[PDB]
Amino acid sequence: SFEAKPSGSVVEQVECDFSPLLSGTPPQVYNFKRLVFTNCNYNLTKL
Amino acid sequence: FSSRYVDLYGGNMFQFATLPVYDTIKYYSIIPHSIRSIQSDRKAWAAFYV
Numbered sequence: 001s002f003e004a005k006p007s008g009s010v011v012e013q014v015e016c017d018f019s020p021l022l023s024g025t026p027p028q029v030y031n032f033k034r035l036v037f038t039n040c041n042y043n044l045t046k047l
Numbered sequence: 048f049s050s051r052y053v054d055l056y057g058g059n060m061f062q063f064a065t066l067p068v069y070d071t072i073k074y075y076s077i078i079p080h081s082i083r084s085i086q087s088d089r090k091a092w093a094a095f096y097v
Contacts, residue, residue: 034069
């Protein structure tokens, strides 16, 4: 095909707190509570 | 979804807000609303359709 090589890439690019999950009594597996985080920065290394 | 936020005249529905309710809701109930006004003050109100 002789497709052109990729060039000139253009890239287009809060801080949700995980403290409530680690603070206080954890809910039991039967009484599990989900937590939803949207549009938030996350640190996977920290957890 | 609110039509007024993006296309009020069109009536097209576009999401404007999200509520983080983890539990599913299987029951909905209309709430009656009254207006406290004198007989002359009373005015007709639009009828909502669901």
